[PDB]
Amino acid sequence: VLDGPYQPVTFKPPNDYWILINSNSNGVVLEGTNNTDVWVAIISIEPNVNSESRQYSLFGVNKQITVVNTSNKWKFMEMFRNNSNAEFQHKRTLTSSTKLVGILKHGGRLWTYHGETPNATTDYSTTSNLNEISVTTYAEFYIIPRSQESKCTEYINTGL
Ligand SMILES: CC(=O)N[C@H]1[C@H](O[C@H]2[C@@H](O)[C@@H](CO)O[C@@H](O[C@H]3[C@H](O)[C@@H](O)[C@@H](O)O[C@@H]3CO)[C@@H]2O)O[C@H](CO)[C@@H](O)[C@@H]1O[C@@H]1O[C@H](CO)[C@H](O)[C@H](O)[C@H]1O[C@@H]1O[C@@H](C)[C@@H](O)[C@@H](O)[C@@H]1O
Structure with missing residues (x-):
């Protein structure tokens, strides 16, 4: 039996459990931080997109990222930094x-x-x-x- 589905939320995942997110949509799929040495966001790009600039809100701040995805698969870019x-x-x-x-x-x-x-x-x-x-x-x-x-x-x- 699957443990879910759960609706979008902010939480602290426990150690040793996978959070598996079922995105249907483009844009930010998840973002996470401990405010010290990890900020991560995963951004979804739909199939067959030629190079273009798109805007994403990461932790409340607008960022411009140039994306591309010529595949028939979805692309998920993992964006990262270790310092504020x-x-x-x-x-x-x-x-x-x-x-x-x-x-x-x-x-x-x-x-x-x-x-x-x-x-x-x-x-x-x-x-x-x-x-x-x-x-x-x-x-x-x-x-x-x-x-x-x-x-x-x-x-x-x-x-x-
Ligand atoms: C080899 C392994 O088990 N791979 C696991 C991965 O294990 C890591 C993880 O436990 C980290 C924790 O920080 O420690 C690593 O081991 C350290 C070790 O403690 C020290 O020797 C140290 O000095 O260096 C080593 C290596 O840096 C472990 O190797 O954990 C991740 C996260 O859960 C798993 O995804 C990964 O599992 C493997 O993943 C593969 C895909 O990338 C593939 O699917 C493999 O089949 C899979 O391994 C299998 O499933 C695992 C969950 C585990 O049961 C493993 O025994 C099994 O073969």
Whole structure:
């Protein structure tokens, strides 16, 4: 039985649970910060978009990012910085036919998926303040224990 769907909210995800977000839409999918050394946002770009400048609100502030996606898959850009005075930079990308995006707090690190479905894999950003990372989701989501991560990886890559 799936733990969800839950509607968009700001919360503090517990350690060792995947938050799996089911985006139908373009724009910001999630954003998270501990206000110290992690700011992350995942931004969705629909299929077959030629190069263009778009505006996104990250933590209440408007940013202009130039995007492109000539694929028939959706593209999710992971934007990141580790300091409040820095600018957001593109760190990684997930290219997806399923439109599911994941985040996980585990083992002193923050985990997301990247690469291209059906072979998306996990990678991490480091932090010395993991517990304090909160997230705001902009679409409905499910919660899946890390003990069942192979299921979450299956969903990411082949659909709910
Ligand atoms: C190898 C592994 O288990 N991969 C896991 C990944 O594990 C990390 C994680 O636990 C971090 C925590 O900070 O520690 C890493 O290990 C450290 C170790 O403590 C020290 O030796 C240190 O000095 O260095 C190493 C490495 O830096 C662990 O390796 O955790 C992530 C987040 O949950 C998992 O996504 C990842 O799991 C693998 O993911 C692959 C896709 O990228 C692929 O799907 C693999 O099948 C998958 O592994 C399988 O599932 C895991 C959840 C776990 O059950 C593993 O045993 C299993 O093979």
